[PDB]
Design a protein around this ligand. Structure first.
Ligand code: HEC
Ligand code: HEC
Ligand code: HEC
Ligand code: HEC
Ligand SMILES: [Cl-]
Ligand SMILES: [Cl-]
Ligand SMILES: [Cl-]
Ligand SMILES: [Cl-]
Ligand SMILES: [Cl-]
Ligand SMILES: [Cl-]
Ligand SMILES: [Cl-]
Ligand SMILES: [Cl-]
Ligand SMILES: [Cl-]
Ligand SMILES: [Cl-]
Ligand SMILES: [Cl-]
Ligand SMILES: [Cl-]
Ligand SMILES: [Zn+2]
Ligand SMILES: [Zn+2]
Ligand SMILES: [Zn+2]
Ligand SMILES: [Zn+2]
Ligand SMILES: [Zn+2]
Ligand SMILES: [Zn+2]
Ligand SMILES: [Zn+2]
Ligand SMILES: [Zn+2]
Lengths: 106, 106, 106, 106
């Protein structure tokens, strides 16, 4: 899918984790996020179209998605060990990877 | 020194790193931050006075300061290897430890 | 492929990185390692056959492979930025994930 | 104290954590280790006497001690939350910082 599509899958799903009553609402949401950042890894932002697919500025942009995946990964372990509030908090710490990518490439 | 004193040493010094023209302005600033978070480690917040000095909520609050110190530490290595922009960016990533402590204990 | 097959793909390829004269010998090798640990993630060790596929002892065993993948990942960035010795060193730091899995599950 | 003194405080205390029956034997030991690596931070190895106190090879050697301190730090939190086996395991993962310093500077 489209990048904006991915980003709007991430954002609308983080709200969901935040106002969640259910573990399986967090767990579900984080999986869609994981799959959206997986898709978004192989994707070129407006601000780096002119930069090479081997650009360091493109490596770093993709590794922002690599970090987000791992952060989401450890969040999914916590939801699966029953720690629903811990998970939501892991989920809230996503936003700093989110903003790191935005400030530097949006 | 007082906690608010420390926090207002941190904040007013992060602005300084952000609008900095000099390496030694970043390097200087980060050292005052380091020393302010060092002081603030041994300090009780309003919201945990009633909680024990061995409280897990007090351990975690102090370990927020432990993380910030290390983050500031790696920022000082970068300023000392000449990487002034890298440093400022390390400095900008402080804000997520900052907000993590605030959301949960301010 | 088989687990032992994977492990013997990892080991024989780490020797290769260590006595390497070429960047593309490190880079090549690390990719086979990456693919071998990817395969080995979805695999059951002798010592946990009786433990559930949702066992915490099986989660942790799989997350050992998750850590190794990321370690190998950052090793591949370094080989691709020209830092062939840095890479080999990243490669040498694999062995502690290697032994952590072995001591606890071999 | 002397570096060898520190190193022989670390080693003889890691054995102690490993064959420990008591939490306060782990907790005690890790504190002596912490204090020994604190001392050893401000210390020059034989192999870098000729290198500058601002050498990158001397920065990295000292930051090896910085990493070890944090590793020991998180080990002490676990001993203080009652997780005596977790602690011993944290303690066993020290050895890779230990060997990283040795291979490169002993
Ligand atoms: C890069 C590695 C990114 C990470 C990590 C995250 N985001 Fe992102 N985001 C990124 C870009 C390049 C853009 C701009 C898209 C455009 O072409 O305009 C965005 C944008 C958003 C948006 C707005 C979408 C739009 O219509 O402009 C949202 C709502 C958004 N991003 C959310 C978001 C969330 C919730 C993240 C983490 C959980 C996150 N982003 C990480 C690049 C990257
Ligand atoms: C805990 C581990 C904290 C970390 C890390 C940071 N801050 Fe903080 N901050 C903390 C508390 C408990 C408070 C409330 C103080 C009070 O008694 O009201 C604060 C407050 C601030 C403030 C406002 C001070 C005030 O007058 O209320 C600022 C400006 C501030 N903090 C800044 C700040 C910065 C810049 C940080 C990182 C670089 C940071 N804080 C981290 C607790 C903790
Ligand atoms: C688990 C998460 C592991 C990680 C990470 C690594 N290894 Fe491993 N290894 C693992 C198991 C369960 C076993 C036993 C296989 C058996 O059924 O006997 C092994 C074994 C090996 C072996 C020996 C293979 C054999 O014939 O017994 C080697 C040579 C080996 N492992 C190498 C290796 C290397 C080089 C690693 C990191 C780079 C590594 N392993 C990580 C489980 C896990
Ligand atoms: C550097 C950052 C180091 C870390 C981290 C650790 N060690 Fe070390 N160790 C270091 C040096 C430079 C030396 C050589 C001392 C000499 O002058 O010969 C050592 C040596 C040891 C020794 C042997 C002491 C001797 O008589 O030669 C031991 C037993 C030892 N180190 C143990 C040790 C342990 C247990 C560590 C982690 C828990 C560890 N070291 C880390 C430098 C560094
Ligand atoms: Cl991917
Ligand atoms: Cl990447
Ligand atoms: Cl899952
Ligand atoms: Cl301190
Ligand atoms: Cl702490
Ligand atoms: Cl300094
Ligand atoms: Cl996988
Ligand atoms: Cl996993
Ligand atoms: Cl690659
Ligand atoms: Cl120190
Ligand atoms: Cl250091
Ligand atoms: Cl202690
Ligand atoms: Zn990457
Ligand atoms: Zn950034
Ligand atoms: Zn701590
Ligand atoms: Zn938090
Ligand atoms: Zn995992
Ligand atoms: Zn282990
Ligand atoms: Zn350091
Ligand atoms: Zn090393």
């Amino acid at each position: 899918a489209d990048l904006e599509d991915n980003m709007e899958t991430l954002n609308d799903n983080l709200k969901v984790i935040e106002k969640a009553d259910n573990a399986a609402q967090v767990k579900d949401a984080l999986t869609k996020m994981a799959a959206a950042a997986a898709d978004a890894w192989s994707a070129t932002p407006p601000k780096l179209e002119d930069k090479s697919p081997d650009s360091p500025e493109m490596h770093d942009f993709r590794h922002g998605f690599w970090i987000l995946i791992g952060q989401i990964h450890d969040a999914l372990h916590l939801a699966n060990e029953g720690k629903v509030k811990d998970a939501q908090e892991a989920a809230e710490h996503l936003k700093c990877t989110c903003n790191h990518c935005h400030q530097k490439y949006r």
